[PDB]
Amino acid sequence: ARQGSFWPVTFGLACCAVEMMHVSAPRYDQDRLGIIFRASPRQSDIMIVAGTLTNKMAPVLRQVYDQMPEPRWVISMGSCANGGGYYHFSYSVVRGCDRIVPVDVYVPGCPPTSEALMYGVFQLQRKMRNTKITRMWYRK
Amino acid sequence: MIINIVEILIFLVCVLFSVAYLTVAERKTLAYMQRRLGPNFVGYYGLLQAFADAVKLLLKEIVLPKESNYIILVISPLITLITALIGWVVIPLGPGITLGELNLGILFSLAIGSLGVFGSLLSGWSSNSKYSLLGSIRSTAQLISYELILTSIFIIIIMFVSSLNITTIIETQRVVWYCIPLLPLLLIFFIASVAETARPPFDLTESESELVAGYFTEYSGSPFVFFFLAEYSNIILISAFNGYLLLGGYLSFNYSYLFNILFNDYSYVSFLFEGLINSSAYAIKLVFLMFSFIWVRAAFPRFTYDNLINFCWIILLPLLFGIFLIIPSTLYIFDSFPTL
Amino acid sequence: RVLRNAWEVGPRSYWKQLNSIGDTKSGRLVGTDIYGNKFYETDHQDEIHLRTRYVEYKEKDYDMSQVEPGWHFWLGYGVDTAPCNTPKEKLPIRAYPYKFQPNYTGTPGAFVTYNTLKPKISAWEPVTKQ
Amino acid sequence: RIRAFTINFGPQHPAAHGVLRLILELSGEEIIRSDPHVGLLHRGTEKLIEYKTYMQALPYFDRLDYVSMMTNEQVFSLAVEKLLNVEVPLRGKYIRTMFGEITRVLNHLMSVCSHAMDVGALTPFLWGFEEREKLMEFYERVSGARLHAAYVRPGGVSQDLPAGLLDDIYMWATQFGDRLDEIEELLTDNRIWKLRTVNIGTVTAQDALNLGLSGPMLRGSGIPFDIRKNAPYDAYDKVDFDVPVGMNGDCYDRYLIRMAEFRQSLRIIEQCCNDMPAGAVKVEDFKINSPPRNLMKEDMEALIHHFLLYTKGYSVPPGETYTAIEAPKGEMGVYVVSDGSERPYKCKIRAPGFAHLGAFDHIARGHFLPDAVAIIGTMDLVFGEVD
Amino acid sequence: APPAGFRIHRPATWEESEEGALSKATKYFLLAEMFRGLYVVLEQFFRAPYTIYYPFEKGPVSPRFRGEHALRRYPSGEERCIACKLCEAICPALAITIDAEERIDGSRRTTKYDIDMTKCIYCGYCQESCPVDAIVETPNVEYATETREELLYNKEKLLANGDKWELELQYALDADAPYR
Amino acid sequence: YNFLSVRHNSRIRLKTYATEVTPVPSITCLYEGANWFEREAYDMYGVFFEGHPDLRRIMTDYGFEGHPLR
Amino acid sequence: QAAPSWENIKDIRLDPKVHVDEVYEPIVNPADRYLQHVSDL
Amino acid sequence: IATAFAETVKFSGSKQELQKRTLALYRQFLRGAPTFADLYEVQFSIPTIRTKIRQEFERHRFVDDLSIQNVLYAKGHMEYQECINFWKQQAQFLKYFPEEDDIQGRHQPSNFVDKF
Amino acid sequence: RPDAEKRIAAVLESFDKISNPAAITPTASFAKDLNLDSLDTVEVVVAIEEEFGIEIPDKEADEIKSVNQAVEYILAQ
Amino acid sequence: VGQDLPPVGGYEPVQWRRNLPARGFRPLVYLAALCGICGYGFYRALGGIQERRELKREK
Ligand SMILES: CCCCCCCCCCCCCCCCCC(=O)OC[C@H](COP(=O)(O)OCCN)OC(=O)CCCCCCCCCCCCCCCCC
Ligand code: SF4
Ligand code: SF4
Ligand code: SF4
């Protein structure tokens, strides 16, 4: 059930958001999988950070991250979003969102393909298929 | 006593399972209308997405320090109880002759469709945010202004009826296919029907991130599935309500079933079949109606609050008062009034 | 008419196919199966652009990167010709093993990394004379 | 007296493709005072390419304005090759012109789609992205990725086209006019977009010239002036190109002028499919851009040029220049002060998305908030072209 | 003073009357212009979709598309990279870190070879400048590691990645190297 | 300053010189397209200006001192 | 017109599409377009 | 064509007038301190804000040139402008406040011996 | 007026840097009598206006040099 | 210079303009037939009501 619906909230900062909305394009559709994102951080599950991440943004990003329910994950979409990427040597850029939010699936490269974002999504769902939360209540 | 509780369980599981798969249905038909494919992956075929999404979004449940939980933990349950479900108390042509309702139909549906509006308003009352409650007052104001011209038109179509119990409209309408063939203000009822249950081309208080990254409150968790299910269930109820009075139940092949059932069955074999085709008639008159809702979701964009109140209190309502300056007039002219 | 154009599969593979892909493509020319997986090109006359070539993955735990990547063009349309045709293009390989680990992410045996060399400075060894 | 409050408009997703932090004040849900607030995305390219070489500069440079990529590549390359006193051969000018116009199709398409999604209609958005995916492939069969590209160089371009691309792009442009009509039939005519867009955000020409506006809003305010017909860079001289002119400075003519620029750019793709010459597609010499990779492995001089062109960049003569072309969001200017060395001593971009955003407060007054959502999308506020 | 800029011809365009003769009230009164758009989207509803079942199908992969930096070797390959540092000096995010040494057999090889896949923009300049064509953008999108520590590609990852496929790279070069 | 004609299709450039110490006056008195750009000039440089409303920061962090394009 | 794209009427063309010659890009001038304009300016 | 809290840029000539102008700036910058503590929800008290504001202006008591004091006045009034509303956020706002010691552990006692 | 300056000589006494409250004559100077800084002068002015919950204009802050002036402006409400 | 992707030795030019209203009955008949349908509808509707005149007194 958690692996099926799986909607994000767009944070969507730059070019990598143009590829994100290309996943909403009809070629590599989100809704053939279930990805129907709301624009609201409480109604969300995972928080795709796409685009580069400024120094100026990062407190707003962590404040969005905190008002988000407990089964939460983060996708770092785009090379700039993880390890700073193509700028990384600015005064005003954050050297990767690992300095801000904990991330569970990275997505490489300036703009990663719509193929790439969906492959990261399926790898995240493959991680979800090993969450084993109920038998971890049983303390396996 | 046992037969009626299993009756009511069959009808509740019909409406609940119905409104469950309706969201998958509309998303599919938007998707083909948007030249793509809808939920095509979930489990066993791809008919199952909402039925997994309900189990998904239960297990979130946040609360907000800006607001008492005691109102928002109940106000989406309010419109889930009253707006969604006990509108079906009228059994809005539970599509046979019979219902699960005694009598005095249409104004009960009026009262409960009226009762949903401050379920929306007190929902938007929450969180004490000076940018939020004005949007709430906006939503509720346009909501009541189109409630009024649902009300003042389905009280004038029953001027061809005059009987207030539920069935008598339906047995009256089988002679003419009275519903739309004598009057096409169905369409303005239809354009009223997108507003009083806002699943609209209006989307007006769903200024999703125009406010501080939240539209209604973002009461996610069980109140989210409550609001979601009640909005869709209000849609299929008011769509049935359109197919109740101003669109017709009891399709004319059952009128021709005099030339069919007399050629099919001998004498009353447990009434085995006619309720089924009657249900088939009402169901195909209902889903074909809401297919136009799913059109108008993805055909025309949002509708600009000041122009929306322009669209209520300036144009449609004086046309309306003309139209029941003539429907009392024209039947008085041509021959005469209806009895009850 | 897509129903009887799925009847060409045979329902034993169809009830698995529908359990794998949401659509049921017509079972067509297999191309050639690979190290893990089975492919299909499609000679169907009426299908949309770039939904011709596809894959049955032979594993319920399915993903990408199970494709041996010589075929990855032929699933991404990098070549008209199926890669089991020309031998003179296909053979640089004398780097002799071809073990082909698909991807190990999230698996305990994930790839990690390390400096190759040694430290740059080479601290002295504690040898004392008298 | 006035006692007005304020809101913050968009933290993350108010207008798509924009971190639109707009500190907006209201009295009666009227925008008496407007204070756009951009700059959340100050990635600092303007600093960073002071330590990069010119070959290194370009994949910084289309990261600005990330919906019109190789047009931004082209304006930087024109600024540099103007400062080199060289001229790219005719094959290069025609393929950069046709790529500028499919890029123009892409930019106006994504602008109208995101505009209409903010307005509320979802189908034009997805229908337009359906052939934006075909244009993504037409980048992809040329570039190394889907939308970003190092394909333009200062010395012309990277590499000549493949054959099936030029054969296919005709068959694409055969249907694109039909589908452009198809998305046009349900917005241009309806009463929604006729009160959803009225004389709204009227900007007079006396004011629009004083605001530093350009491009589509300028020509919507009824001054028949762009750069392309008036300062013809890169073979727009040689192609029949007709420019639409507004009559009323509202957002409706700013809609219809883009919708005319589509079916003007398709003529350009037509005649650039026809007039495509054969020739060198890089620059003719090899002192300045790149050697050909065939004879870089059979020759001394080709190796030394290859080596120095990827180590030290290359020589640029000193001095200043400024070069503006009409990107599909408006006049993009590039102002480059070159040291006389391997690396640019100063580069200042100039963005219509930084000027139109500056004009936003003077335009937005006397409206409502759902007016303001549309008037963002009209003036092409994709905030990756702020800094 | 000719100064030829003139002639916008300024159409006065009164347009008071004779647009319609009560047909105007019909088209305004009921939504004929808008029912037209509904008929358009219904006619669009019947036609073909465009979804590509991405685990099972794939979008078009041009031969010049960029990927994950696999190091080629020769036929019977002696690790074709020579640490020539040209692929260092143009990596525009400085995502290249090389160190080299004279190896035992006399030639020069890479002591370490480092790609910050955190910060590889995929400009392909590495591929456009390594003269022995030894670093190559792949077409494979085979990624999505859970740590940065699973992204920082050393020499062994890249040699392994080239050893995983050169078939695809041979297809790529043999459709591209007469254009590069 | 780069300026653009409309009647004449002709650009021009106009330069001053200013020190971090002493300001030079703005040009927002003449037209309204200035007051955004001169904020950008002040933020990137600390070239301080004069006769101007709302000389804020846009292009940096709000607690960030220094001036980057120095 | 008609005969454009899919649901095909079986009519297409990818043949005889050439102009085969040797180039004649006779030019040398770096910046001579501007000299009259520079003299005006 | 607007402001936000009436930021004006016009440097006067005489050092007495600049003195008075910085004085009135100090009054507003001091008066807004409970508005600051309301707005950002700090841990420390309003007198901590006041003694640190006094510290910040005593950092530039002995600056000679009025033509340096001009842009110091602009920086002061401008950061007052960006503090009087919610442009700055509390993560941005704590860059003035080296509040806690226990983040550092044992550290340099400013002796030469404990540089080693 | 009566015992307004009781509150003022309570606030200024509660304010630091004035080690001698016996040196605080009420009708006396600020910077001459107690060596108050010109910065600290308007600091204690803002302390005074914050104690009485009252807001002052700019020239009223300009003219205050002794507390008899301050009490005379306190008298305005 | 060798075989690069030159143009075609023809054009076959394509669409660059607008499109049209659908069927031939643009005028008010698209309204006037509406007055036909009500002109049928009441023609039975009141008549059914007229028949209930005989029906009610029957009971
Ligand atoms: C005569 C003999 C018979 C006698 C009985 C008469 C019964 C006739 C039946 C009822 C008559 C229908 C009346 C329809 C009312 C609609 C009027 C209307 O919409 O006015 C347009 C108005 C435009 O706005 P505004 O700018 O203020 O206009 C001034 C311009 N100078 O307002 C607007 O802004 C337009 C907003 C409309 C939003 C509609 C959204 C789409 C609705 C389409 C879905 C319906 C299709 C499905 C049903 C059709 C079934 C066939
Ligand atoms: S990761 Fe790449 S695509 Fe994304 S913002 Fe950075 S440079 Fe742009
Ligand atoms: S592809 Fe580009 S970013 Fe990556 S290493 Fe090569 S030159 Fe650098
Ligand atoms: S460009 Fe070639 S020789 Fe130079 S470091 Fe890269 S692989 Fe080695």
PDB file of C-alpha atoms and ligand atoms in Angstrom, chain A residues 14-16 51-52 78-80 86 110-111, chain D residues 63, ligand 2:
ATOM      1  CA  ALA A  14      15.740  24.415 -11.411  1.00  0.00           C
ATOM      2  CA  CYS A  15      16.318  22.478 -14.651  1.00  0.00           C
ATOM      3  CA  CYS A  16      15.930  19.199 -12.783  1.00  0.00           C
ATOM      4  CA  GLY A  51      17.545  21.642  -8.860  1.00  0.00           C
ATOM      5  CA  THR A  52      20.516  23.143  -7.145  1.00  0.00           C
ATOM      6  CA  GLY A  78      20.120  15.938  -9.807  1.00  0.00           C
ATOM      7  CA  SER A  79      23.873  16.125  -9.374  1.00  0.00           C
ATOM      8  CA  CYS A  80      23.654  19.567  -7.787  1.00  0.00           C
ATOM      9  CA  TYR A  86      28.108  21.659 -10.945  1.00  0.00           C
ATOM     10  CA  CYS A 110      22.725  17.188 -14.523  1.00  0.00           C
ATOM     11  CA  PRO A 111      19.439  16.813 -15.556  1.00  0.00           C
TER      12      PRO A 111
ATOM     13  CA  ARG D  63      22.079  26.531 -16.742  1.00  0.00           C
TER      14      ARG D  63
HETATM   15  S1  SF4 K   2      21.905  19.183 -10.998  1.00  0.00           S
HETATM   16 FE1  SF4 K   2      22.297  19.741 -13.108  1.00  0.00          FE
HETATM   17  S2  SF4 K   2      20.206  19.992 -13.958  1.00  0.00           S
HETATM   18 FE2  SF4 K   2      20.000  20.190 -11.741  1.00  0.00          FE
HETATM   19  S3  SF4 K   2      20.184  22.390 -11.221  1.00  0.00           S
HETATM   20 FE3  SF4 K   2      22.240  21.437 -11.057  1.00  0.00          FE
HETATM   21  S4  SF4 K   2      23.159  21.873 -13.031  1.00  0.00           S
HETATM   22 FE4  SF4 K   2      20.915  22.076 -13.287  1.00  0.00          FE
END
